[PDB]
């Protein structure tokens, strides 16, 4: 939903 | 996290 959130979610 | 959830989350 946001870029830093995406990184946190994927990792 | 899961594929159908991703679709729902993106759209």
Numbering used by the authors:
A (entry chain A), B (entry chain B): 102 to 112
Question: What do the authors report?
Answer:
Herein we report the first X-ray crystal structures of mixed chirality α-helices in short peptides comprising only natural residues as the example of a stapled bicyclic and a linear membrane disruptive amphiphilic antimicrobial peptide (AMP) containing seven l- and four d-residues, as complexes of fucosylated analogs with the bacterial lectin LecB. The mixed chirality α-helices are superimposable onto the homochiral α-helices and form under similar conditions as shown by CD spectra and MD simulations but non-hemolytic and resistant to proteolysis. To get a direct insight into the structure of AMBP bp65/bp69 and their linear analogs ln65/ln69, we performed several crystallization studies using either the compounds themselves or their racemates to be crystallized as pure compounds, or their fucosylated derivatives of both mirror image peptides as complexes with the P. aeruginosa lectin LecB. While previous reports of similar mixed chirality AMPs concluded on either unordered conformations or helical conformations appearing in a membrane environment based on deconvolution of FTIR spectra, here we reported X-ray crystallographic evidence of short mixed chirality helices consisting of only natural residues existing as helix bundles within the protein environment of a lectin and almost perfectly superimposable with their parent homochiral α-helices. These direct observations unequivocally demonstrate that the α-helical fold with only natural residues can sometimes tolerate multiple stereochemical inversions without significant conformational changes.
Herein we report that optimization of bp3 by sequence and residue chirality variations followed by structural studies led us to the first X-ray crystal structure of an AMPB in the form of bp65. The structure of bp65 features an α-helical fold essentially identical to that of the corresponding linear peptide ln65 but comprising a bicyclic helix staple. In all four individually resolved homochiral bicyclic structures, the peptides were present in almost perfectly superimposable conformations featuring nine of the eleven residues forming two full turns of a right-handed α-helix including the pair of stapling cysteines (ESI†). The two N-terminal residues and the N-terminal toluoyl double staple formed a turn conformation. In all four cases the α-helical fold resulted in an amphiphilic arrangement of hydrophobic and cationic residues corresponding to the helix-wheel model and explaining the membrane disruptive activities discussed above. Remarkably, the ten crystallographically non-equivalent stapled bicyclic α-helices observed in the X-ray structures of the homochiral rac-bp65 and bp70, and the mixed chirality bp71·LecB complex were essentially superimposable, with RMSD < 0.6 Å for the peptide backbones. In the case of bp65, bp71 and Fln65 the peptides were aggregated in bundles of four of more helices via hydrophobic contacts between leucine side chains.
